PDB file of C-alpha atoms in Angstrom:
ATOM      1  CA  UNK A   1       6.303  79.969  59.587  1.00  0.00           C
ATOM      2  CA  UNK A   2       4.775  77.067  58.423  1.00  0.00           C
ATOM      3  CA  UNK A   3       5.294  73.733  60.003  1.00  0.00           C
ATOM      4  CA  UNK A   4       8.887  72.047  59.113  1.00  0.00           C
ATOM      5  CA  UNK A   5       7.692  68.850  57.147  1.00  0.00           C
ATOM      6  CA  UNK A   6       9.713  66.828  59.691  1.00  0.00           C
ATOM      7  CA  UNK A   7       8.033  67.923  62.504  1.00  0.00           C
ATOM      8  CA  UNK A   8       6.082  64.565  63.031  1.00  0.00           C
ATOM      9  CA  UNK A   9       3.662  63.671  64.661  1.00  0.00           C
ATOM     10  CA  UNK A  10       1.602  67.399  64.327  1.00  0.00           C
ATOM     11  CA  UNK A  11      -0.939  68.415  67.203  1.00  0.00           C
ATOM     12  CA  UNK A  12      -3.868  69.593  65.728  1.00  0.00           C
ATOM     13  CA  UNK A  13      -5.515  72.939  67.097  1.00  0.00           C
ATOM     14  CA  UNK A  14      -7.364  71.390  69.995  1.00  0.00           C
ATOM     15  CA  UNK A  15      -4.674  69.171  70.984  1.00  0.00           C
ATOM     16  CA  UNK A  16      -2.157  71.962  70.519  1.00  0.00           C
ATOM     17  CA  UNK A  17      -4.509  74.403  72.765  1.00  0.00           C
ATOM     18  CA  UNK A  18      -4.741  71.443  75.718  1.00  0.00           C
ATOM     19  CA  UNK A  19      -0.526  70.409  75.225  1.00  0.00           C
ATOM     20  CA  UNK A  20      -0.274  74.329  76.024  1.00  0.00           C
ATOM     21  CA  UNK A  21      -2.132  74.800  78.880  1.00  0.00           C
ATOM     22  CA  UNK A  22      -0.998  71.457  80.663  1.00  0.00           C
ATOM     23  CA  UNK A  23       2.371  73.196  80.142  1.00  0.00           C
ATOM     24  CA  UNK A  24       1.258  76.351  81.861  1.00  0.00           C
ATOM     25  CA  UNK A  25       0.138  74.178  84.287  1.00  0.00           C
ATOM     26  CA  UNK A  26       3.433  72.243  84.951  1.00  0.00           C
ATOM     27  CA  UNK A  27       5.801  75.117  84.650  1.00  0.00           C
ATOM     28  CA  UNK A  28       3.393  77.004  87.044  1.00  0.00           C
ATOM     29  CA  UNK A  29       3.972  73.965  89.710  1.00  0.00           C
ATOM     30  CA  UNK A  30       7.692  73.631  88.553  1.00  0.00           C
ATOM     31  CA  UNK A  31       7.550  69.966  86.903  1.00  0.00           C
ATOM     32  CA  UNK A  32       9.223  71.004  83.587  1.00  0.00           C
ATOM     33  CA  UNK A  33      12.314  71.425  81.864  1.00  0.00           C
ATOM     34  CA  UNK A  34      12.761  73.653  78.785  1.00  0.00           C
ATOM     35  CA  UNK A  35      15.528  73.563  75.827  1.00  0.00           C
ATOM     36  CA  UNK A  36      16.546  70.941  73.851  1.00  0.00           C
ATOM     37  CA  UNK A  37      19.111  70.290  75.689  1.00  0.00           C
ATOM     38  CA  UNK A  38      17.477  69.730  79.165  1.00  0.00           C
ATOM     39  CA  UNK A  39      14.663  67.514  77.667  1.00  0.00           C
ATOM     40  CA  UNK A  40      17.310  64.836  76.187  1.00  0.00           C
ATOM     41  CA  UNK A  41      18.939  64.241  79.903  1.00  0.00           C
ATOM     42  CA  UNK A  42      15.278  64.036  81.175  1.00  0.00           C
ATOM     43  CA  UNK A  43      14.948  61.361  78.874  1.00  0.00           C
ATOM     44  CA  UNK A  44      18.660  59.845  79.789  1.00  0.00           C
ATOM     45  CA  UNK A  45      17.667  59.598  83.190  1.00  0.00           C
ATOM     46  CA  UNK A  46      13.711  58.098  82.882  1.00  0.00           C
ATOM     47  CA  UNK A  47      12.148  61.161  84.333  1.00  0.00           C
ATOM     48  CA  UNK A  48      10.272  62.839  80.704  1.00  0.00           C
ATOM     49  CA  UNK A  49       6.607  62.279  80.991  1.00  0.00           C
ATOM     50  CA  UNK A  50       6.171  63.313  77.317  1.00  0.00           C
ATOM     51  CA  UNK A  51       8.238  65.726  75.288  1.00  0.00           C
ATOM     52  CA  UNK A  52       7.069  69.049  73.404  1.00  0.00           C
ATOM     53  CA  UNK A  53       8.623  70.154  70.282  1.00  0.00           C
ATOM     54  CA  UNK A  54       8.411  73.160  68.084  1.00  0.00           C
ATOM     55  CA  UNK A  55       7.431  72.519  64.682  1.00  0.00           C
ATOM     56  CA  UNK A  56       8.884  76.114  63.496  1.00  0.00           C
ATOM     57  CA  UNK A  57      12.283  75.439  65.440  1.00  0.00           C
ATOM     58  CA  UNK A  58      15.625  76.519  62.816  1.00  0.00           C
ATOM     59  CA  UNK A  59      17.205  74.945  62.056  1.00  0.00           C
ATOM     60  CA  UNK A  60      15.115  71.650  63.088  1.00  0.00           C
ATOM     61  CA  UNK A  61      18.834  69.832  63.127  1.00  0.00           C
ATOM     62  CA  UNK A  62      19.143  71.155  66.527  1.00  0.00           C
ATOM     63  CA  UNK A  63      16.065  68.621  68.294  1.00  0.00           C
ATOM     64  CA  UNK A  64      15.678  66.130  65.669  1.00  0.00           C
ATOM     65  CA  UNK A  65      17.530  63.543  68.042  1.00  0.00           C
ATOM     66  CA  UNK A  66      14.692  63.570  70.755  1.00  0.00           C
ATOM     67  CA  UNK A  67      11.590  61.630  68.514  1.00  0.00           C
ATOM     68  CA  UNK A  68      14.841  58.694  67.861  1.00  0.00           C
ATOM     69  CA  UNK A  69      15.790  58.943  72.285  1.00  0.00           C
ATOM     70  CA  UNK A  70      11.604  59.134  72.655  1.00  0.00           C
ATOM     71  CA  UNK A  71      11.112  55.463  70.563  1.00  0.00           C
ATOM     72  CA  UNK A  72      13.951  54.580  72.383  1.00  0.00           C
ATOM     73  CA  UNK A  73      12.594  55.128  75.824  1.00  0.00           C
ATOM     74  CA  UNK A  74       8.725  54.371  74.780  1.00  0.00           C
ATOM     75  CA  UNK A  75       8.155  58.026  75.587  1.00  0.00           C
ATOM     76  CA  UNK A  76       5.707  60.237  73.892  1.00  0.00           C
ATOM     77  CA  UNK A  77       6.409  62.961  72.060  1.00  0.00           C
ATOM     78  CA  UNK A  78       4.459  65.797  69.976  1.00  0.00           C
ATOM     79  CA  UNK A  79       5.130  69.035  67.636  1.00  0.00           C
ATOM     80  CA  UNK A  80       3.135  72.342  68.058  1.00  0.00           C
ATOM     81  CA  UNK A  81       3.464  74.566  65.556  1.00  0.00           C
ATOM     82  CA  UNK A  82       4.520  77.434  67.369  1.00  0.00           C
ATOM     83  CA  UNK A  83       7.799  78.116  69.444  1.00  0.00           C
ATOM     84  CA  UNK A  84       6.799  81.756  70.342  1.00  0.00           C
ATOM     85  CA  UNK A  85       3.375  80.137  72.272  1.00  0.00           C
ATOM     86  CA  UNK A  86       5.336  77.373  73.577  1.00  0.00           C
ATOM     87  CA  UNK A  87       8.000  80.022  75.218  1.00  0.00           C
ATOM     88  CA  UNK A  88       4.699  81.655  76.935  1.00  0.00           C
ATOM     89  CA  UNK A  89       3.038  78.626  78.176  1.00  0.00           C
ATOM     90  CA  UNK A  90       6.485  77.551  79.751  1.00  0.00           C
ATOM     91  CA  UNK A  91       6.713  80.851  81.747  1.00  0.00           C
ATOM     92  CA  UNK A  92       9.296  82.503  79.309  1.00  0.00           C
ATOM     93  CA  UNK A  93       9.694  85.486  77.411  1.00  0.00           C
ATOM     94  CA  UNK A  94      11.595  83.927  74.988  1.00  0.00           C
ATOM     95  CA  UNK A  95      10.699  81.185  72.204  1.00  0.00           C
ATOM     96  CA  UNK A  96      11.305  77.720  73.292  1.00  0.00           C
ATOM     97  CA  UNK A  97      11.393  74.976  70.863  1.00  0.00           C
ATOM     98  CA  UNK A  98      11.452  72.193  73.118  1.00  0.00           C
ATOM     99  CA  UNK A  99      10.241  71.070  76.666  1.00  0.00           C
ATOM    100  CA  UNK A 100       9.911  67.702  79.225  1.00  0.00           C
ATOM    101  CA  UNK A 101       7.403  67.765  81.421  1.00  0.00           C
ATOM    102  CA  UNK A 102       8.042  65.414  83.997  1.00  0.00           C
ATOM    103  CA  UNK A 103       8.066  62.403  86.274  1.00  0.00           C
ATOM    104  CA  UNK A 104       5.781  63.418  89.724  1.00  0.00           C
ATOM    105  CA  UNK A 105       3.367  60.345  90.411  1.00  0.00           C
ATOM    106  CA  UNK A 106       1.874  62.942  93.129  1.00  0.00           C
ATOM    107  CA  UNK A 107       1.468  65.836  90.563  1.00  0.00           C
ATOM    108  CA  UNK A 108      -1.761  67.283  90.987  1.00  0.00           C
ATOM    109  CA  UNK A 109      -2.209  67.230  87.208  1.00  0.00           C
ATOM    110  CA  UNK A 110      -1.320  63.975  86.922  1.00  0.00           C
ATOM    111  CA  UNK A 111      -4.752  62.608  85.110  1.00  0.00           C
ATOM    112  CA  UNK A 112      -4.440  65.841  82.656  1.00  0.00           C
ATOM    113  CA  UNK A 113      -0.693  64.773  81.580  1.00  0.00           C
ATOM    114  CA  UNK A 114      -1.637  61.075  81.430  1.00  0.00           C
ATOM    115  CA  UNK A 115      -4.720  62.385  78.877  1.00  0.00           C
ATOM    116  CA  UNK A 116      -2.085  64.392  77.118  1.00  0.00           C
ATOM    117  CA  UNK A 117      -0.102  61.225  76.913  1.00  0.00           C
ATOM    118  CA  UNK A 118      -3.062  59.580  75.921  1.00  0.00           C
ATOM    119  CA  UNK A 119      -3.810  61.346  72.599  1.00  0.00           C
ATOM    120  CA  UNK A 120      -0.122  61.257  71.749  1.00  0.00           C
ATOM    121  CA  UNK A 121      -0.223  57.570  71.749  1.00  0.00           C
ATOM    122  CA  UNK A 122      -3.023  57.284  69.148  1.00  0.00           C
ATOM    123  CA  UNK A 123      -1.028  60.244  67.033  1.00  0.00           C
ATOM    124  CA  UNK A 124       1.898  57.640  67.205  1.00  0.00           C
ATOM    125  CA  UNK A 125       0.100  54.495  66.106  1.00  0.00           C
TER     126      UNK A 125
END
């Protein structure tokens, strides 16, 4: 399925293929949350680094709240196109159309989540 036209802003492949593996990274050293749900009270409580979104999720109703909390919160936030490779980069064998990676100031992939962050950013003007 093609991405949902209000899936904005769209990684690109490259920036799609590093989003993913800095996920694999974080859910292998257990600094991430998955579901739609979990990523909005990381987001209530300060602790999202940037959030991940699925630009096949449907219905889109269910995460369309978390780009409005994001600008709210001056967080980052990005689509992928594909929920079935963001459910295996989080660790899952299920789709997963939305994740928070986040807060750990210690996190030894700290510099590759702040360069994640950083081409997010420019995505978001």
């Amino acid at each position: 399925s093609a991405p949902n036209p209000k899936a904005f802003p769209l990684a690109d492949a490259a920036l799609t293929q590093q989003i993913l593996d800095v996920v694999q990274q974080a859910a292998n050293l257990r600094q991430l949350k998955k579901g739609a749900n979990e990523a909005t009270k990381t987001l209530n409580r300060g602790i999202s680094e940037f959030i991940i979104m699925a630009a096949d999720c449907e219905p889109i109703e269910i995460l369309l709240h978390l780009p409005l909390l994001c600008e709210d919160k001056n967080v980052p936030y990005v689509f992928v196109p594909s929920r079935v490779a963001l459910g295996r980069a989080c660790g899952v064998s299920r789709p997963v159309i939305a994740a928070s990676i986040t807060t750990n100031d210690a996190s030894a992939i700290k510099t590759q989540i702040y360069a994640v962050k950083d081409k997010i950013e420019t995505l978001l003007i």
